[PDB]
A paper describes a structure:
In this study we show that the Bj-xtrIT β-scorpion toxin can be expressed in its natively-folded conformation by secretion of the polypeptide into the oxidizing environment of the E. coli periplasm. Instead, periplasmic co-secretion of the four bacterial chaperone proteins DsbC, DsbA, SurA and FkpA encoded by the pTUM4 plasmid enabled robust toxin over-expression. Purified Bj-xtrIT-(His6) toxin at a concentration of 10 mg/ml was mixed 1:1 (v/v) with 0.2 M NaCl, 0.1 M Bis-Tris; pH 5.5, 29% PEG 3350. An all-atom structural superimposition of Bj-xtrIT-(His6) with the untagged Bj-xtrIT structure shows that there is a root-mean-square deviation (RMSD) of 0.45 Å. Nevertheless the backbone atoms and disulfide groups all superimpose and show that recombinant Bj-xtrIT-(His6) was expressed with the native conformation.
β-Scorpion toxins are polypeptides of 60–76 residues stabilized by four disulfide bridges. β-Toxins induce a hyperpolarizing shift of the voltage-dependence of activation via a voltage-sensor trapping mechanism, whereby toxin-mediated interactions stabilize a persistently-activated conformation of the channel domain II voltage sensor. The extensively-characterized Bj-xtrIT from Hottentotta judaica is a member of the ‘excitatory’ (inducing a spastic paralysis) anti-insect β-toxins and its structure was the first of this class to be solved by X-ray crystallography. The toxins display variability in length, sequence, folds and molecular targets but share a common structural property in that in each case a network of disulfide bridges stabilizes their respective fold. This extensive reticulation establishes the tertiary structure that presents the bioactive surface as well as conferring significant thermostability and resistance to proteolysis.
Residue numbers in the entry: 1 to 72
The structure:
Amino acid sequence: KKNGYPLDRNGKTTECSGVNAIAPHYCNSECTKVYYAESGYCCWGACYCFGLEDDKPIGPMKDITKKYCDVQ
């Protein structure tokens, strides 16, 4: 398993801003219901999931981004 920003059919991450950035429910629902991950939340403007299947495409990210998204 892995963590990351899952990509949709068009290769785009799921955007999240405003309340959907402060409250994790929107991204947690996308992560679990659409991507079958364990959980998720909004990290720096896009839905970040925990426990995605290894084969699920995730968006490119710097090592500092993964560390930041993982530590919260």
